[PDB]
Amino acid sequence: ENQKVYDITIIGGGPTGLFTAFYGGMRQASVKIIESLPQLGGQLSALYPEKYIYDVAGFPKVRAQELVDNLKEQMKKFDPTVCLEEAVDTLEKQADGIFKLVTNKQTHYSKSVIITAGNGAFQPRRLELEGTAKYEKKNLHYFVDDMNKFAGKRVVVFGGGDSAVDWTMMLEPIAEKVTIVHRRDKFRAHEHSVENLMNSRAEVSTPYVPVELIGDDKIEQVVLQHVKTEEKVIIDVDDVIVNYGFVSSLGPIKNWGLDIQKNSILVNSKMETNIPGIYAAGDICTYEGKVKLIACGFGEAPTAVNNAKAYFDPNAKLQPMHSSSMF
Amino acid sequence: NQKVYDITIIGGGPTGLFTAFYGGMRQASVKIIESLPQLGGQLSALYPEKYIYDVAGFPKVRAQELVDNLKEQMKKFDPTVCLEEAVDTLEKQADGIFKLVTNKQTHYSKSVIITAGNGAFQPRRLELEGTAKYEKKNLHYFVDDMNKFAGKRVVVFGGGDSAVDWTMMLEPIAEKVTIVHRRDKFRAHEHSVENLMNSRAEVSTPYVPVELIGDDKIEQVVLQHVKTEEKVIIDVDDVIVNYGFVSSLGPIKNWGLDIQKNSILVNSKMETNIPGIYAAGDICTYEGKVKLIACGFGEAPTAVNNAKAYFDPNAKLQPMHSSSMF
Numbered sequence: 001e002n003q004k005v006y007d008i009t010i011i012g013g014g015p016t017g018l019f020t021a022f023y024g025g026m027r028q029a030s031v032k033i034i035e036s037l038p039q040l041g042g043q044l045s046a047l048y049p050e051k052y053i054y055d056v057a058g059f060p061k062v063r064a065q066e067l068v069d070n071l072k073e074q075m076k077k078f079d080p081t082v083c084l085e086e087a088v089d090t091l092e093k094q095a096d097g098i099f100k101l102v103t104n105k106q107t108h109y110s111k112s113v114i115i116t117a118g119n120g121a122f123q124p125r126r127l128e129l130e131g132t133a134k135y136e137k138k139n140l141h142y143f144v145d146d147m148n149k150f151a152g153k154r155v156v157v158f159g160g161g162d163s164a165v166d167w168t169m170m171l172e173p174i175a176e177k178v179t180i181v182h183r184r185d186k187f188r189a190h191e192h193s194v195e196n197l198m199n200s201r202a203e204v205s206t207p208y209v210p211v212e213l214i215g216d217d218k219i220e221q222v223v224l225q226h227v228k229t230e231e232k233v234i235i236d237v238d239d240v241i242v243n244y245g246f247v248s249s250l251g252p253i254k255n256w257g258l259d260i261q262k263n264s265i266l267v268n269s270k271m272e273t274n275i276p277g278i279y280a281a282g283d284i285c286t287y288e289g290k291v292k293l294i295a296c297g298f299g300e301a302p303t304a305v306n307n308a309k310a311y312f313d314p315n316a317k318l319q320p321m322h323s324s325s326m327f
Numbered sequence: 328n329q330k331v332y333d334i335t336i337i338g339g340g341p342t343g344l345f346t347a348f349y350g351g352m353r354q355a356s357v358k359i360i361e362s363l364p365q366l367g368g369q370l371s372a373l374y375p376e377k378y379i380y381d382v383a384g385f386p387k388v389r390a391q392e393l394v395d396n397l398k399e400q401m402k403k404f405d406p407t408v409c410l411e412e413a414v415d416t417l418e419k420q421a422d423g424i425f426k427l428v429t430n431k432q433t434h435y436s437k438s439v440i441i442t443a444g445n446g447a448f449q450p451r452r453l454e455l456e457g458t459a460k461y462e463k464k465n466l467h468y469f470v471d472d473m474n475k476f477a478g479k480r481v482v483v484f485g486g487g488d489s490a491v492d493w494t495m496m497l498e499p500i501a502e503k504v505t506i507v508h509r510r511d512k513f514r515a516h517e518h519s520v521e522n523l524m525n526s527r528a529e530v531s532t533p534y535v536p537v538e539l540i541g542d543d544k545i546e547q548v549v550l551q552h553v554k555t556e557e558k559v560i561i562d563v564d565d566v567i568v569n570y571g572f573v574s575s576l577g578p579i580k581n582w583g584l585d586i587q588k589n590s591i592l593v594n595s596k597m598e599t600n601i602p603g604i605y606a607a608g609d610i611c612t613y614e615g616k617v618k619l620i621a622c623g624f625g626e627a628p629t630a631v632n633n634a635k636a637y638f639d640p641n642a643k644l645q646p647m648h649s650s651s652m653f
């Protein structure tokens with residue numbers, strides 16, 4: 001890329017966007033996936049990677065994350081450009097019909113856009129304390145990418161979920177001290193992971209809620225409050241890590257000039273929105289009879305690709321070659 | 328039965344199989360009616376050995392193995408499967424129930440989802456003027472149990488992989504088996520042809536059958552060399568044709584449906600022009616429609632859920648997550 005006009009840009013790397021990316025390869029289009037999170041997989045990877053799915057055609061029983069791995073494998077053949085940690089904010093048609101898409105990182109350009117944004121861009125749930133916002137460019141963390149930057153550091157983890165415990169286990173042998181804070185004594189996690197949390201050098205502050213962060217520019221202390229007694233505890237830290245889960249909402253998608261009803265983008269049977277060049281597929285799209293199912297999003301995706309391919313490549317046919325004759 | 332089913336499915340291809348599974352997920356009584364004595368549609372009939380690359384979640388899957396997965400997925404709710412039946416008439420009766428007549432029996436249904444592809448599959452027929460009268464006897468297009476040919480004299484017509492395969496299966500079973508093809512080069516796997524030559528199988532090449540002889544059962548077969556036009560005659564107990572499969576819409580065009588270029592026109596609820604009748608898969612069309620197995624997989628639950636809302640108005644269009652049905 002740089003300055004490069006792609007053919008098909010996909011907003012959303014959930015399962016629908018992954019299969020959209022694959023089928024863009026089947027039609028020889030230059031393909032981009034733009035995804036809000038630093039991982040692909042949408043609801044499947046973020047909100048339930050361990051559940052079994054029973055209604056994808058041809059899988060009597062498949063685990064959610066292994067379906068996403070299958071999908072990433074299937075597309076690996078045409079190597080689409082994946083742009084993680086980017087949330088599309090503005091989307092406009094410029095004077096010559098090309099789309100300009102602006103994220104928090106950069107500008108992208110595209111001949112057609114297939115929005116597969118599901119229930120909207122995923123963000124980690126924000127910490128609800130009025131001071132916090134100023135710390136995000138410093139030592140308040142919602143992701144634990146490069147874990148070794150916490151070697152010999154004092155670190156606190158807010159959250160009582162399965163994901164929160166696991167990040168604690170990962171940090172206890174890395175950090176000088178690690179502490180986990182949750183408002184009830186029962187953690188919402190696996191018995192073996194709680195047992196391993198209990199039996200380690202990680203301090204477990206329950207039933208408390210954080211009530212204050214102290215620091216001029218970097219966080220330096222955290223104030224906790226017992227939920228029953230109202231007594232307080234103070235902790236010195238080098239880094240604070242929030243893990244309250246994920247949230248999603250349409251957000252800026254409602255400012256792109258699209259026809260939207262009950263948080264769904266309206267499409268016709270070509271997966272076309274009201275703006276020539278823009279398509280939608282998967283949980284975010286709707287039409288008469290639409291059913292929010294993964295098998296249905298997998299059918300909408302090649303319809304959108306094949307119709308978009310006919311929109312930007314006037315010398316191409318709507319029907320693709322049999323895949324059994326291409327490899 | 329006399330039983331009026333909720334969902335009767337015409338066609339046991341990949342689309343119909345998944346349609347049937349999803350009818351179980353919505354707790355409708357479900358029947359599949361299929362022409363062949365096997366499920367799998369185009370996948371099982373026409374290319375059961377090729378690899379498919381563009382079904383979601385399978386980077387590379389063998390066509391017959393995808394069909395086996397689908398049948399596995401379907402056994403969970405045990406739909407009533409009716410093989411070797413081709414639906415010939417389809418009528419809405421006075422009370423709104425659908426009557427379907429096959430070559431075997433009559434069926435009734437509240438709703439019908441046509442997943443018929445390019446039409447009913449039949450074996451490509453032997454093109455000779457007598458023939459048809461022998462089909463109730465010893466002219467064979469299907470072989471359930473190969474051991475019914477033990478110690479019999481058998482001739483096999485065909486030059487394809489399946490013809491060679493049925494011949495190799497008969498070689499230790501039959502007193503004598505002969506295979507007939509109009510060219511010397513068989514259109515079959517080079518290695519399997521080698522086994523044929525090095526076996527007790529007689530290879531009558533390059534010949535064409537030109538006459539079947541017999542009062543009621545076939546008793547002899549007359550062959551003709553393709554270059555010299557000399558003739559050979561062979562005594563037989565059974566004749567087995569293996570020329571492949573053929574398909575056409577046939578009676579589907581006599582059901583009052585809106586049809587365009589061999590496709591049933593549907594809207595986005597998979598509805599045809601007749602309330603109570605739906606279509607999904609290769610046989611249905613609409614603006615932007617693409618003939619792909621994944622698209623048939625997405626059209627299938629659309630048709631089920633919209634049909635569930637049609638025949639059970641006190642039930643919801645959207646079902647909860649699949650993780651709570653197991």
Ligand SMILES: Cc1cc2nc3c(=O)[nH]c(=O)nc-3n(C[C@H](O)[C@H](O)[C@H](O)COP(=O)(O)OP(=O)(O)OC[C@H]3O[C@@H](n4cnc5c(N)ncnc54)[C@H](O)[C@@H]3O)c2cc1C
Binds near residue numbers: 016054116284295648
């Ligand atoms: C607990 C649970 C169980 C479920 N079980 C089943 C089941 O058994 N069967 C079934 O069929 N369905 C099931 N579903 C629903 C299924 O997950 C959805 O049908 C499917 O995940 C939607 O896929 P998608 O790609 O359309 O959307 P998503 O999975 O939501 O992916 C959209 C992606 O786009 C990203 N994104 C959005 N906006 C932007 C933006 N502006 N810029 C960049 N990225 C953006 C999001 O962060 C996300 O990663 C379940 C859902 C849940 C929550």
Ligand SMILES: Cc1cc2nc3c(=O)[nH]c(=O)nc-3n(C[C@H](O)[C@H](O)[C@H](O)COP(=O)(O)OP(=O)(O)OC[C@H]3O[C@@H](n4cnc5c(N)ncnc54)[C@H](O)[C@@H]3O)c2cc1C
Binds near residue numbers: 340342370
């Ligand atoms: C060689 C070849 C390779 C292909 N490769 C691919 C590929 O890689 N990817 C892809 O997506 N698609 C591929 N396709 C297309 C794919 O096979 C079709 O999309 C798919 O088979 C459609 O499934 P279906 O169940 O809708 O129809 P079908 O598979 O045609 O099944 C319809 C069934 O209905 C039965 N039937 C019809 N009429 C009646 C009746 N009146 N009564 C009773 N039974 C009836 C038939 O006997 C048949 O079993 C290929 C097709 C061919 C021929």
Ligand code: NA
Binds near residue numbers: 197198199200201
């Ligand atoms: Na401990």
Ligand code: NA
Binds near residue numbers: 339
């Ligand atoms: Na079918």
